Amino acid sequence: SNFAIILAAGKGTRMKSDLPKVLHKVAGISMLEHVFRSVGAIQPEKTVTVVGHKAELVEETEFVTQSEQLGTGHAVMMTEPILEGLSGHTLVIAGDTPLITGESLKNLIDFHINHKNVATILTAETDNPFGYGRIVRNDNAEVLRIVEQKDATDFEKQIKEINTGTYVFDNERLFEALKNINTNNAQGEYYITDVIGIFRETGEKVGAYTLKDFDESLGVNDRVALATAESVMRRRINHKHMVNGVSFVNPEATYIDIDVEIAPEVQIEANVILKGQTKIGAETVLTNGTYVVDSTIGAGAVITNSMIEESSVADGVTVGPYAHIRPNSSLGAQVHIGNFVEVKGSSIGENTKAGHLTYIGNCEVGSNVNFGAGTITVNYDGKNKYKTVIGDNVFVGSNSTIIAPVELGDNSLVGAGSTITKDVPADAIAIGRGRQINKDEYATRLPHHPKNQ
Template sequence: MTNYAIILAAGKGTRMKSDLPKVLHKVAGISMVEHVFRSVGAIEPAKTVTIVGHKAELVEQVLAGQTDFARQTEQLGTGHAVMMAEPALEGLTGQTLVIAGDTPLITGESLKNLIDFHVNHKNIATILTAEAEDPFGYGRIVRNEQDEVLKIVEQKDASDFEKQIREINTGTYVFDNARLFEALKNINTDNAQGEYYITDVISIFRQNGEKVGAYTLKDFDESLGVNDRVALATAEEIMRRRINKEHMVNGVSFQDPASTYIDIDVEIAPEVRLEANVTLKGKSKIGRASHLTNGTYIVDSILGEHTVITNSMIEESEVADAVTIGPYAHIRPGSHLAQAVHVGNFVEVKGSSLGERTKAGHLTYIGNSEVGSDVNFGAGTITVNYDGQNKYKTLIGDNVFVGSNSTIIAPVSLGDNSLIGAGSTINKDVPADAIALGRGRQVNKEDYAKRLPHHPVNK
């Protein structure tokens, strides 16, 4: 049998109090609807239809080229949203998963188990359920002696006995595709909200004597639907625990997992050590046996093996093996640090490449520069790359020594083996093997200090 999927992503999410569509709020680095889409991929659907509505174009941008879209121009309930998928799925034979785009914690494994259960039990519909410690507010699953689902009872309609039921509806379903759209033609808006509810389809199947089943999640956390910022933070916390646990199982050491923040697409090799308050975002990759100390923040960057990053920030850059960075360094986008480079405290590198074993120990700015190997930057060195309108490049050869407190005004090149005297301002090319001095002449005025009121002689 063939699988299909419908992802409901049309809602505004009023309780989020946000201009952003609810399903685009992020959990562990990607939007909730992307989490759902990835999990849905586990059932290998022949066709996926994502129902969009509020700010549809934003949701379509995120999933462009990966799914069909159908627009729900009026928000008339879950049943109405599913109706929008009929043109894409009508006439197809198989089973269709219906899932909300605000359930980021659901796993692909659970969805595969749900589909298998549905097929093996020859159900017309199967509801994904969960056991809640406190089921208040959820729709309850009422079963018969054969374990088939009789109905879903909402909290406000439940009897005292039904309120004791802990099995709740998660809002995820599998239907026989053809019967789903046939039944949707028979639901109505005769309810307090004046909306079409997908749960009414379950009642129609039962009235027709058709088999409705329920598959219960092993982990209640997977059922979480995010409707407000509190639930969003809860989802983030649970997802972070999952991510960190997977990395620990794979050989990564955490000083304090609860205070380590890793996005879902980050890759970390074994033997890496992460101290507390480390943040790894985007598609960062951390090489084997690297050590990231407290406060390190890395975004969309690649780190080689045996790197040591001390309380520093790296953005959209590449760092080779055995590089040391920090403390308090900032590697800005577009930078490339070759093997065994050292970038020390209060050093900023932006859009630059540094060759092997090059060192900038402290208090230095390197911007829009191509730097060779075995270069030494003295403290306080600045590459002046911006004149207020345009950026210019500095070229520095191999084995160059730049003395402390030097200012290198681009565009300029420093040849191999050249030496820049401390305190120099350089605005002309320096040939290979040359020494460049760009200082003002020092003048000493004998005994002039005695003329100043604060001099001891005048007190």
Template sequence: MSNYAIILAAGKGTRMKSDLPKVMHKVAGITMLEHVFRSVQAISPKKTVTVIGHKAELVRQVLGDATSFVLQEEQLGTGHAVMMAEKDLANLDGQTLVIAGDTPLITGESLKSLIDYHVNHKNIATILTADAKNPFGYGRIIRNSDEEVTKIVEEKDATDFEKQVTEINTGTYVFDNKRLFEALKNINTNNAQGEYYLTDVIGIFKAAGEKVGAYKLRDFNESLGVNDRAALSVAEEVMRERINRKHMLNGVTFTNPKATYIDIDVEIGADALIEANVTLKGHTKIGEEVTLTNGTAIIDSTVGAKSVITSSTIEHSTLADSVTVGPYAHIRPDSTLEADVHIGNFVEVKGSYIGADTKAGHLTYIGNAQVGSKVNFGAGTITVNYDGKSKYKTVIGDNVFVGSNSTLIAPVKIGDNALTAAGSSIVEDVPADSIAIGRARQVNKEGYAKNKPHHPSQK
């Protein structure tokens, strides 16, 4: 039998107090909708339908061609949302997973277990449930004396006795696909919210004598539905704990995992050491035996094996093996650092290629530059790449020594094995094996200082 999936992602999420659709808010680097979609793939759905509504085009952009979309123009409840998928699914044989797009903590393993339970027990409907310490606000699972599910009752419709039940409805279900759409034709809005409840189909199945089951989650955290910023922060905390634990089990050392922030798509090699207050975002890849010290932030970048990044920021760049950066350096987008490059304290690199074994120890700006191997930058060096309208390139050959406080005014080329004298402004190309001196002439006026107010003779 085939599996299908319906993801509910039409709501605005008023309690988020945000202009974004609720499912577009991010947890550990990707939207809640993407988390749900990835987990759904564990059941290998033959077809996935995503129900969209508020700012539908934004939601479409997240999943693109990976799913079919149906529009719920007016949000009239979960039952109404599922009705929108009727044209796509109603006549298909199999079972359909229905899941909310604001449940980012649900795992693929749990969804697969839910499907397996449903099939093995030959249920018409199976509800994913969980035990809650504080069930307030959740729909309650009501069972009979034989522990069979008899109905789901929403908080606003529950009696005082029913409100004492701690087994809650997570809002995720599996249904016999054809029977689901048949039952949806018989639900109504006679409830406290005036909406079409998807849960009402459970009562319809029970009244028809059909088999309804419930599969209980082992981890209540997976059931979390994010309705406001407080719940979003809980989801973020739980997800990051999962992510960090995964990396630790794969051989990564964290000095303080609770103070380390790693997005879900980050890759980290074995024997890496990550100190507190490190942030790794996007599709960052960290090689084996890398050390990242306190305060480092790396975004969508690759760091090669055995590199050491000390309290620095790297964005959209590629670092080869055994590179050292920092402290307090900034590698800006579109930069490439080859093996054994050293970028020291208060050095900024932007849009540049730097060859192997090149050193820039301190207080240097390298922008829009092509730099060869074994180049040494003295302190205070600047590549002057921008004239206020256009940017220009600096090209530096191999084995060049750039003297301290050199200003390289692009476009300019410095040949292999050349040297620029300290304090020079270089405005013309420097041939290979040459020394370039671009200083103003120094003139000493002997004895003139005696007439200045600072001189001891004037006091």
């Protein structure tokens, strides 16, 4: 009953990009993927995407290639093999209108079914319709035709209802009308709007469903329009989170990707970034500058101005300010990671604290461990990485240098300032540092001394 054609071969010159236009991201997914999601709401039996140059990349729906730019008519014709003969209602939508909703496309197909139209145009009203196709209606307010700006009479220029370039067609007629135009065109290019002209010649019924919101119809041709799309999608996402019980200091300046999940009672300061497959648990606090990519954060956590990537963070964890949790990290329940701390490829057990100026790389760390300020786990020799194992209740002295592969046994202490080259037994202390020597009056000889300035 329902088919979908997505036009993804249109010109992208004004993007000034080596990336095909429809692959440019809005809130973490391509414009094309936003259109795939809205198209999904009509439950189409077949979906055909028409691509052009760099087809391989877009493919890397059913796909067909448009090798030559001969207009939207030729584009739609590239789906003839797959859709010719079939009965039911065929949506034609651009890959560069990512703000059109599933609700809008459901209401388009229903309106078309409703009025037994051969074609239905998705229209919208704007007070500045310059450049757009105008929807011409009669006394009875039925759709007669689409008039382009260049063809518009001064009276027609007054028309505020415009063509969004989104349509539903009776599938059978659509492929019949295109062949007609193609063969009798006396010209190379042809346009999906040419089919509306043919239906006018035959008196076949064409209708228009108007979007309440003109801004939903945005067709992205450049990075100005890309940023407008980002602004609308950001507002849409953040609105949903607020209705679901998430507080935002500033939802106009908080950057949350389309698939991020956020539990009720979360508080988000301005200028928080959440990306990819990120999940935030109940009552967690995210402060200004926090940046989370493809990570799970538990309940009752506080992430202060920190960057967390491809990692798991348990309930009650405190991170920051200015901490970096790098890929394949796990922070256990109630872990504290303080300022200027980097964790990479490491598991950290519950209640463990690394408060300051510390690097934990390729470590397996137990519960109730304390990392002194300035602790470095040394994991790399210039060719290979080595694992360090740290047991429960270990006290790693400030400014210590732990050279993997070593094991620090349960309850051990590393003396502050120590270089550790060998395993430390459970309940031992290890000390690897110079003994302090004091030299009376020697500072009087040195350039910092007041007596020497």
